């Protein structure tokens, strides 16, 4: 399914969407697009589904800040499976994003719900993507406004490499 299911799966991305709000208000970010897509079936394993039988999804967000663009990727782990980092993609070609994103979604499922980093390297270079760790205890016990802003800082910061 290539349909954008943003609003219907928004409950699963409560924290992540609060992060988007903070980037907009305190870190001069503009959101270019938000899309929430179903993960594809690959073989007979069932990681593309949640524990409850519903589709497991992935959210992509295009962001502009300080004259540069990046794309955030966030994998739905609402059923309590091991949380993935938030991917920050840079130098993303939007003219091929539709097809590339499709490869990425398949790579996530194929990698047993992990980022397909060899694919990311091929697509954007080793320096074209990085992971950002979620705030501690995200999913169990609410996260403070302080740590939410910290999360935002970690997303937009500059890397050594």
| Parallel/antiparallel/unpaired status of strands 86-90 and 57-65 | unpaired
42: DSSP letter: -
Q: Are 85 and 134 in contact (CB under 8 A)?
A: yes
Expressed in Å, this structure's resolution amounts to 1.8
Comparing C-alpha atoms, which of 90, 160, 97 is closest to residue 129? 90
Q: What are 12's two structure tokens? A: 């699963």
* Residue 159, C-beta contacts closer than 8 angstroms, at least 6 positions apart: 127, 130
Structure token pair of residue 152:
């935002």
Show the tokens assigned to 113. Answer: 């719900």
The residue written with tokens 């935002």 in the block is 152
Among residues 101, 96, 95, 97, the alpha carbon closest in space to that of 116 is found at 101
Half-sphere exposure in the Cβ direction for 15 (13 Å, CA)? 24
Place of tokens 């390297």: 121
């Amino acid at each position: 399914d290539a349909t954008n299911y943003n609003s219907i799966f928004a409950n699963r991305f409560a924290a992540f969407d609060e992060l988007l709000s903070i980037l907009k208000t305190k870190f001069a970010c503009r959101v270019l697009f938000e899309e929430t897509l179903v993960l594809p079936k690959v073989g007979r394993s069932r990681l593309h589904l949640c524990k409850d039988g519903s589709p497991r999804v992935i959210k992509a967000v295009g962001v502009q800040r300080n004259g540069s663009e990046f794309v955030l990727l966030e994998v739905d782990v609402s059923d309590g499976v091991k949380m993935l980092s938030t991917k920050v993609l840079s130098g993303v070609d939007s003219e091929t994003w539709r097809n590339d994103f499709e490869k990425i979604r398949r790579g996530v499922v194929k990698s047993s719900l992990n980022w397909p980093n060899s694919l990311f390297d091929q697509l954007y270079g080793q320096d074209g993507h990085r992971g950002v760790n979620h705030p501690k205890g995200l999913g169990e016990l609410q996260v403070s406004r302080e740590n939410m802003e910290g999360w935002a800082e970690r997303v937009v910061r500059e890397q050594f490499t």
